[model samples]
Target chain A: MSMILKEIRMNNFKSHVNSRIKFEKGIVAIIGENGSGKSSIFEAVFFALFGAGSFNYDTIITKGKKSVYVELDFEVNGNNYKIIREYDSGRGGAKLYKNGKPYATTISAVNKAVNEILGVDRNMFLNSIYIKQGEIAKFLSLKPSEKLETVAKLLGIDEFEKCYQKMGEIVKEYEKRLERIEGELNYNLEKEKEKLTKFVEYLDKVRRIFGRNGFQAYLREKYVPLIQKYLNEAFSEFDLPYSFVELTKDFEVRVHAPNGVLTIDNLSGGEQIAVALSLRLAIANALIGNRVECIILDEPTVYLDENRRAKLAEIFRKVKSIPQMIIITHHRELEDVADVIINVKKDGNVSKVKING
Target chain B: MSMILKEIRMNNFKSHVNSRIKFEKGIVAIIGENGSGKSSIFEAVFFALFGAGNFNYDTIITKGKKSVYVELDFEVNGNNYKIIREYDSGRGGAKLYKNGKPYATTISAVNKAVNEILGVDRNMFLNSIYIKQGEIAKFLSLKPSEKLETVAKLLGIDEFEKCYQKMGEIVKEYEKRLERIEGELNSLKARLKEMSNLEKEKEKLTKFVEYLDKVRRIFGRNGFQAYLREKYVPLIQKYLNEAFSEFDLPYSFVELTKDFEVRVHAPNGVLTIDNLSGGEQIAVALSLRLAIANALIGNRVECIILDEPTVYLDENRRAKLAEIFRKVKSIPQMIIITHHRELEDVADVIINVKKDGNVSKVKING
Candidate 1:
């Protein structure tokens, strides 16, 4: 079990009135009618883990709804941790008390402690988790740059790649210094007397070149760009009308154009939704690497016609090793394919969330 | 000369307090802000002629206002006729009076009268008129069955097509009777070797077949279907999908397999709006027939309506081609270029209608 969300407790988390939902090991289907708050569970888990809400629930704290509190029980590697977020009484704050220990004060301190406990840090955890929602039909229509950015983010190139770039700069400086020393050594050879100290000068040059004072960095420059270029070219070849991937360089990949500086905001509304979902799927696939977990997509096929909707479902189902997958949809056609079903109904204060025939 | 709306006089036509605007012989462009009521002129004319209000303003009666009156002054074949549509307190609700005569009792009667004045019947009048709107784009996004229903309406092929079909049944009955009559004539000819009348009876049978040929095609796919199939069927689907980016139409090629069946092979599965995006759809709807498929349609369109057309359009250099609309269709046409784009960017003449739904300012762009 890679990471299983045990249980989530939500308090006023986007119209939820003290709702507590427990998760199973495999795919969990949360079904509800429009505006019945089936999405609150999905949002609560995200806010607890990533501190961000879903696209529709940008501002999770609804009007007249008090502070939203979420507590997530998820296991990483082996150790289980309960991450709780509470913002109420006009004082917003996050508290981490792991295994009843006075855990940490700062986020950095908490990150270190959590990493030691889970054997995997925040970055690694984020790369693997797949969070999807409506507007996923657009995913199939990604541009080249958008695809590149998504691949880079999923591949965890942000941290090590930026550090490696600095190494290249250091290598350039050393090469320049070595060239200057070689020029001086060549000029001094004309003087016979200067030849006595030539060995000493050469020794000094060798010492400077292999300086113990600074960390000498050798950059694998050819490898990174070569791989990046190839990946971008491959994504563009997919010929999806709209797709976006954001790599570490703030660069985007789109199908219609080559990998360059691009912004997601520049795309149309339908294009944006599609590209964003495509980017999410690409990232999820990339991060999964070898261990492919069942993907859960909530209401993914909104605003798509029969053709697009069918094609997407085909692509998703073809990923054979998906094992168990759950898709939440209001459309009758989509819900017909499920092995099990879950229905959520809200009648005033008394709301029902349960398994259905 | 064709029937042109010369001047409209309204004592109380919905929001009109007291207004009359004379139109030119050629194209007329109405441009104004959202609430300016440029669309009211079209509504008033429709009501004056057909007694059918475009925007449903039947309830908007003025309190102290004289029983509403709308007058249209125009010539058909160098003969002028003033069509007066009015509602009096005691008089029958709303009726049509032609040349000061109560010529029409019903809406259809009014339509027939108008067609007669123009020297053309209902079929001829309907065949010449075309109403273009942004909503047509919505139709392009539908499935084949759904789109065909709308296309039938837009082409005005449904009404007579159904009637022609009913007449085909009648023709079938006549053919069956003619075959029996021929058998009777042959039997009679065998006996009558005297002065035979069978030859004359046979001639009647031959003439019946020719008569059937005249009204043979009362229904089903008309001549236009062949044209639509051979020329339009394939191109329309391709251009429709291409026109609307959001459509990423599943089938680019639509071919008529038979009288009713159509075969199409478009892209299926996961269509992004970019493939069939919204902006592209709008552009496609507006430009598809008028732009790329102009060769398909005859060179004339009466009126064009853009419902809040500029709401979401990206007006870049790529999209700034409103003036090019004029180039799409032929001139000496009654073009109703409706938009709120100021300085009359998309017009030859601009008429700023007031809030009271009356033309306040009308001028040529030059």
Candidate 2:
């Protein structure tokens, strides 16, 4: 099912008393000066569609105000659904709402409904979403280890990681036991075989928890690229490459000069970002079936210099025919390539929703 | 001036509704059950004398009630003064009053007075005076780095820590540069001198900070020996050592051993408390404070307040702790606060405070 955000309604939600905005399935730009509540629009959209927003309540609410609320209207394959969240006054916890009804009976119910349209479930969903506030540079600044960590997250490989870690520990323990027993690799291997049976049993248990088919698709669709990026580099005889080496993958990450095999870790910051962006676009394109609607780039030029910015803009323009694409940007110069320009005004007490038409 | 809590007054502050309770000198122990508002008594004492208590109250009005007020009277060096915290249905804060007269213009002014007298800011004073339920054990459970973080805080070493980290980075950079200039040794003199000077300055600042740290330690205080000699030391040496030998550390050394650097000399290798068994470790830990308990028993302490001090003790050792408390009861005003019914049998002043905010004090003394 194609998921599209229809509307965002906020009640006493962070610098707003009762605010609501509706959007079409195309490029819609909401622009305002700093502190004029441009970020609030993003926050509202995030919370409405995803059940949570960026910035904690402490950071979001107007100074001295107590609580906040946000509501979202989503159209999934033409079926309209509503999601809402409300914060209690006096430092109490926030409550969740769905379909204009208080819906907190079961977590699984929420997960099923939301995940059905989004193509991803909370079980695989990363809590953290990187927005276009120069995250590209920030991602670059992160060390290789830090990048590896983020990749693990974005790929949703925590279960696999835990399994890998536990296996490593078991192997180490068995080796230690073997050493203590004096050159009993055969015995140790036999013991490990038993452990492997248990390990496979454990995997079956995990697979049961995370549906086997769902888990497999999740790995192939999401994790493959991430692991493929971080998987490996050629060190001596070992071809330590990402989870799988696929040159034809959406995003091609090749290290400096490529001495045999390239690992993303060996790539520089700018190069990594370039590869990551390419990968994201490629994955999105591959995922885009015949039911093509629109591809909206919200402030995509951030963190990039003039050359990179122009280069990226050109790249987007090249794919303009793929779908009824829309570019939302604060920088008006970035709108030079846009078919239409919508300038939203930040007037007091009014949202000032205007049409570029 | 000897600091002793005198009287506490509360108007709708928790269970106390316009109630005033007086505290006497020689170790005032307001023993009450869990929620009987016994701790609140201590809290009010702290708040009144210091002008604020740490409670989560965005709106101090009682749920379904109008408002709440808290006031306290205490003798600091035998001089009596009062502090009041007023909370209305709408908005309110605290005001300190000296001898029933308004004494503070603002909180900062009150903080100045507290700083001048206690050598501690409000938080530091609160942390020092009140080691609340499960706190010391909680602090003990923290990692060494995490524990040292608070030490860093109390010593005001955060900025210095940043400087130290920067200095380390500088040293790393300098080493890298030195490696590059290893063949050109003559050219590296100026850079080496520069690095050396920075290193020397950082070292001096670090040493100075450490010295301040040492001075701020509990052992360096004047009443430390007396505090240890009076009670903690005697309890450790008499009850702890008598019960479990092989551990020689006395009570006064407890605070010193917080860094976990207790080294007991041995022939093969230096024995450590960390290396000891759980039982032996408990004895070692307790042994560290035996000297202080002894020092404080008759000299510094006139009253002994033991609030769940047997938490980490084994069943047998818990009995031993009770015996130790019993021994202390002979010399000082003893107030034992516990929910454990067994301890209740021996307590002269047994206060049962229920979670429903019930407080009942029973005394068997004729």
Q: Candidate 1 at residue A102, lDDT?
A: 57
What is candidate 1's lDDT per residue for A84-169, written digit by digit as tens?
76655323345556555656544334544554554333454554454545325434455655554444444454443432232233
Q: Looking at model 1, what is the TM-score of chain A?
A: 0.52
Model 1 per-residue lDDT tens digits across residues B119-179: 4333334334434333343334444454445444444445434434433433454466567
- Deviation in angstroms for A60 in model 1? 31
Model 2: CAPRI class:
incorrect
- Per-candidate iRMS values, in order, are 41.3, 25.3
True contacts kept of 1: 0.00
Q: Which ten residues in a row have the lowest lDDT in candidate 2 chain A?
A: A232-241
lDDT accuracy of residue A322 in candidate 2: 27
Regions of model 1 farther than 4 Å from truth: A1-357, B25-27, B52-57, B63-66, B75-80, B90-111, B118-133, B139-149, B158-321, B326-329, B337-339, B356-366
In order of the candidates, what TM-score does chain B achieve? Answer: 0.53, 0.54
CAPRI class assigned to model 1: incorrect
Q: Which candidate leads in DockQ?
A: 2
